[PDB]
Amino acid sequence: DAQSFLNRVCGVSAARLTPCGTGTSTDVVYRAFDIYNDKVAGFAKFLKTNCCRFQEKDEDDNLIDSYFVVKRHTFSNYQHEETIYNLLKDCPAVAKHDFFKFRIDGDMVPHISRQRLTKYTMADLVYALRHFDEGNCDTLKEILVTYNCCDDDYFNKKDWYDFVENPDILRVYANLGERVRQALLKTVQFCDAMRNAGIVGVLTLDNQDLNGNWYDFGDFIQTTPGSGVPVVDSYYSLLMPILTLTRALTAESHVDTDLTKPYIK
Ligand SMILES: Nc1ncnc2c1ncn2[C@@H]1O[C@H](COP(=O)(O)OP(=O)(O)O)[C@@H](O)[C@H]1O
Ligand SMILES: [Mg+2]
């Protein structure tokens, strides 16, 4: 049944979940991957069809920006990603994973469940700000609304996106900055967690939600501990136009790097 699957996705964590899809079936979503394999490459919007998505509601039954992504795949990938997670489990900049095997139709399909991710990832934000189209900007509007950058009526303005007709949009974009900067800090933790665990892998923007956690260990190979290496060449470089558009480092002008504290004299 699709309800017992929901109960297992809830797990030991006290979570109230509602299915973003329907009937223990994968939810298909148009996302913004940064991919490179033997056949395809590039920073493009693909259509992912490998994850069952559930949305959490806080009591009072309001839907919040926290999702349980229950990607199902082959068993060897399940075991390998379970081991890589058990190596990287203790890092705080790692999404919470739950590994189980659920009898879907007549077979025990192995599912991995990433808990309390956001709706969009850092790749979606970077793509929305790097491939901007004012006629088709719905992920940028949703990202700005869901993180209290604006009030969802700010887009009723004629040219809200224009930098020279509405300079106030800068003030809106800077409201993402502290959310971006924390993500950066999370990366520096995750890299460390790889380096001390001996895990080699490429860091991509689509494996990090807007909170900052990391959840994709499929193409991570482990070496001797203390000598791993994260490849962050494409991660940081694609992010660079966003680190000044959102003014991510404005918290560095304050004493003790706290936005509430006064500026450094
Ligand atoms: N054809 C496929 N069907 C299902 N899962 C796949 C397929 N190809 C790759 N995967 C898995 O998906 C992962 C990459 O998919 P991705 O869209 O990043 O999902 P996520 O980022 O949520 O893990 C890889 O680690 C791999 O294990
Ligand atoms: Mg991924």
Side-chain angles (χ1 to χ4, degrees), residues 129-189:
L129 282 178
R130 260 173 142 264
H131 294 93
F132 181 76
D133 185 15
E134 86 284 346
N136 179 27
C137 48
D138 289 7
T139 64
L140 181 57
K141 289 183 184 184
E142 191 147 1
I143 284 173
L144 290 179
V145 165
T146 193
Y147 299 135
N148 302 335
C149 300
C150 34
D151 251 317
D152 200 10
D153 294 5
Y154 189 86
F155 317 120
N156 292 6
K157 195 138 47 188
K158 38 192 306 297
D159 315 325
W160 58 269
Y161 38 80
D162 206 327
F163 283 114
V164 322
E165 300 294 332
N166 182 67
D168 187 67
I169 193 59
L170 295 177
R171 180 201 60 85
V172 172
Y173 285 156
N175 283 124
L176 281 168
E178 190 62 28
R179 182 158 288 267
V180 175
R181 189 189 73 92
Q182 293 292 328
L184 287 175
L185 296 177
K186 298 266 200 171
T187 310
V188 191
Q189 305 184 54

Side-chain angles (χ1 to χ4, degrees), residues 232-251:
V232 292
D233 223 19
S234 58
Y235 176 84
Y236 283 121
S237 201
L238 291 165
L239 234 190
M240 284 185 185
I242 323 295
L243 303 176
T244 46
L245 193 52
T246 64
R247 296 205 289 259
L249 267 65
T250 44

Side-chain angles (χ1 to χ4, degrees), residues 8 17 24 45-46 53 59 62 77 83 157 174 198 206 228:
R8 229 304 184 177
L17 293 174
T24 179
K45 244 174 164 56
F46 295 90
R53 304 177 89 250
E59 178 62 25
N62 290 328
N77 177 83
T83 55
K157 195 138 47 188
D206 38 307

Side-chain angles (χ1 to χ4, degrees), residues 181 251-259 261-262 264:
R181 189 189 73 92
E252 293 286 337
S253 306
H254 296 251
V255 55
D256 292 333
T257 331
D258 201 334
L259 278 174
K261 285 185 169 56
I264 292 185

Side-chain angles (χ1 to χ4, degrees), residues 88 90-94 181-197 203 208 211-214 230 236:
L88 296 173
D90 301 325
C91 182
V94 167
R181 189 189 73 92
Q182 293 292 328
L184 287 175
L185 296 177
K186 298 266 200 171
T187 310
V188 191
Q189 305 184 54
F190 185 64
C191 293
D192 285 350
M194 300 172 66
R195 171 72 182 180
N196 308 127
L203 296 198
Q208 182 178 37
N211 291 334
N213 303 10
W214 293 86
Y236 283 121

Side-chain angles (χ1 to χ4, degrees), residues 6 13 22 27 37 43 55 67 78 81 147-148 159 167 201 218 260:
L6 212 161
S13 173
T22 163
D27 180 61
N37 49 39
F43 183 48
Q55 186 172 18
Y67 297 79
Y78 160 83
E81 201 152 341
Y147 299 135
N148 302 335
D159 315 325
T260 74

